[PDB]
Scaffold this active site. Structure first.
Site, PDB file in Angstrom:
ATOM      1  N   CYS A   1       3.829   1.229   9.682  1.00  0.00           N
ATOM      2  CA  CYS A   1       3.709   0.185   8.673  1.00  0.00           C
ATOM      3  C   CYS A   1       5.081  -0.199   8.153  1.00  0.00           C
ATOM      4  O   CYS A   1       5.956   0.653   7.986  1.00  0.00           O
ATOM      5  CB  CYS A   1       2.816   0.657   7.525  1.00  0.00           C
TER       6      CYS A   1
ATOM      7  N   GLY B   1       2.758   5.741  10.500  1.00  0.00           N
ATOM      8  CA  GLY B   1       4.123   5.551  10.035  1.00  0.00           C
ATOM      9  C   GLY B   1       4.823   4.308  10.546  1.00  0.00           C
ATOM     10  O   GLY B   1       6.016   4.126  10.270  1.00  0.00           O
TER      11      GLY B   1
ATOM     12  N   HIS C   1       0.808  -1.214   0.000  1.00  0.00           N
ATOM     13  CA  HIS C   1       0.000   0.000   0.000  1.00  0.00           C
ATOM     14  C   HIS C   1       0.849   1.275   0.000  1.00  0.00           C
ATOM     15  O   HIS C   1       0.276   2.370   0.011  1.00  0.00           O
ATOM     16  CB  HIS C   1      -1.012  -0.010   1.166  1.00  0.00           C
TER      17      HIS C   1
END
Ligand SMILES: O=C1CN(CCOc2cc(Cl)cc(-c3cc(-c4c[nH]c(=O)[nH]c4=O)cn(-c4cccnc4)c3=O)c2)CCN1
Ligand SMILES: O=C1CN(CCOc2cc(Cl)cc(-c3cc(-c4c[nH]c(=O)[nH]c4=O)cn(-c4cccnc4)c3=O)c2)CCN1
Lengths: 296, 296
Positions: free
Chosen positions: A140, A138, A41
């Site tokens: 991820c 942030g 993503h």
């Protein structure tokens, strides 16, 4: 003596964390040999319904960041929900493999922001394939791992937080744990249950460390699962077997510990075990076998 | 979202751990520049009453171990209860200083056996200058640390386990926390108290993460300490001040949170906060400010 939620040393993983930027979005990536793994993503903008195969990006559209040195993407591909970025080979790569874990298994999490590790903690793959992590925006691309001998076994990459505040992500080959998908649609965590075998392992830890909750009864495996269901994951024969070593070191038969757990579930605690006022279920039998001293 | 007992990444400390052998006794040492720090009781044999100054050893009596490479002791000295071994300069030395912490402060512990790190966990210097660690035989020399920006602030080296199962040790300059001494004589942990300011910080964490225990009352600082005493460390003005930022981010005044804590102490929990059924006191206000995202 003592008993703590214990993570593996995070050093062999800190050397792998990098930044991955694409457009306005920056998240964390994992640098192993000449490949950089991160959540796909990261190519997304809007997200309400992305067709990820939709080929529109160039190698030079991905900016990789290894401290201050900037890395150059020379090839890209997508494996499931994970993006793999070929770059021009991390000297700090450890012995590692990718494994997909069963629910109830534990791992350490190295939380990272902008490729810079922030902290380390333990948690379990819940039976509903979420993890009760600690993650802010942030995060991820942060990964979860176990260390066996000198090998880092990576098992989790963070993608997403659910509305109840728990977290969902994938193995390092991009397959989500649970029925979750990486897009901005309504998805809820399913009903969760308690990891019985792990509660039992933790009671054995309490005994190894010298502690009241025991009793004189026993129970059948069937009669135990009857009570557990009313409160807990069914306990299988394979679970009993796995509790073998802990039962022999302590001389309390598995099904005796179950009778204890039965009583504890029926009567509550009346006031703590290993510094806890509730039945902890994020230690495996392997984790308990900290009471013995295994290093890596 | 979420909230976990979070250790600093242990990587900058793993590169410093070594083995120190003297005679039959082996424990862990800390390798910074060309100096190796370890508990002075490594020169001991019997111990019932050692006169440590008692000069009888040579440099070549200490065997240092940095992985497989063996290090050569070229000089030795004793500073308080810590031994300092000059050796022929660790390339993996980070930015570091030695600090002696106040009770109530937290740190991470890298548990090590035979110089090989085993695990990492959080804990606090209790008000009675013990730590509720997780330590087995051969753990002596494991250190505790905080990481600020890129600097490792070492604050604890493990020496000893007490009969109640808690642990005692020194700062990295060899001064014990508490009234403890490194010899095999009867010494008990003193009465412990709960770290109030940290309970309060943890309630603010619960609020930041979206959670019932609040109420409409207030209290005086004096009236609060009255109740706390009956259950807790007195709360000072400086404590109130330190809780400042957390109170402003949440819009709950410190003394309102105290009234909440008062009620929680008086009525119990009636059934959990941040996944805990008891009032946690091993998060500082600084630790809570994980809810914001500070990395290193
Ligand atoms: O019902 C529901 C409703 N949800 C809707 C939200 O959907 C998604 C989907 C996907 Cl694929 C990813 C996210 C997500 C993105 C980002 C992120 C974005 N941009 C950056 O630049 N950096 C970042 O870190 C961060 N975090 C996040 C936040 C806090 C803790 N940990 C993870 C996301 O969770 C969110 C779906 C679940 N079920
Ligand atoms: O009342 C009392 C009664 N105590 C009597 C015991 O006294 C001492 C004194 C001193 Cl200086 C050190 C220890 C001690 C040595 C060693 C050790 C010895 N040899 C090796 O080769 N490797 C090792 O690791 C290990 N651990 C230990 C054990 C388990 C967890 N963590 C630390 C010690 O605690 C014990 C005193 C406190 N108060």
């Amino acid at each position: 003596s003592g008993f703590r939620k214990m993570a593996f040393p995070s050093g062999k993983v800190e050397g792998c964390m990098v930044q991955v930027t694409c457009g306005t979005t920056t998240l964390n990536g994992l640098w192993l040999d000449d490949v950089v793994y991160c959540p796909r993503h990261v190519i997304c903008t809007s997200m309400l319904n992305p067709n990820y195969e939709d080929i529109r990006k160039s190698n030079h559209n991905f900016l990789v960041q290894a401290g201050n040195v900037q890395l150059r993407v020379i090839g890209h591909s997508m494996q499931n929900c994970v993006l793999k970025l070929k770059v021009d080979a991390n000297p700090k790569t450890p012995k590692y493999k990718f494994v997909r874990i069963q629910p109830g298994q534990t791992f350490s999490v190295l939380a990272c922001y902008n490729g810079s590790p922030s902290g380390v903690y333990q948690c379990a793959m819940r039976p509903n394939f979420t993890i009760k992590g600690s993650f802010l925006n942030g995060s991820c691309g942060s990964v979860g791992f176990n260390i066996d001998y000198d090998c880092v076994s990576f098992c989790y990459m963070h993608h997403m937080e659910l509305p109840t505040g728990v977290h969902a992500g994938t193995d390092l080959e991009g397959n989500f744990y649970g029925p979750f998908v990486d897009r901005q649609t309504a998805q809820a965590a399913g009903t969760d249950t308690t990891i019985t075998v792990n509660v039992l392992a933790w009671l054995y830890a309490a005994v190894i460390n010298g502690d009241w909750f025991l009793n004189r009864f026993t129970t059948t495996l069937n009669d135990f699962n009857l009570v557990a269901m009313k409160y807990y994951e069914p306990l299988t024969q394979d679970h009993v077997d796995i509790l073998g070593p802990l039962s022999a070191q302590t001389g309390i038969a598995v099904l005796d510990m179950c009778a204890s757990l039965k009583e504890l579930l029926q009567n509550g605690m009346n006031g703590t075990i290993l510094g806890s006022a509730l039945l902890e279920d994020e230690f495996t039998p392997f984790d308990v076998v900290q009471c013995s001293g295994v290093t890596f």
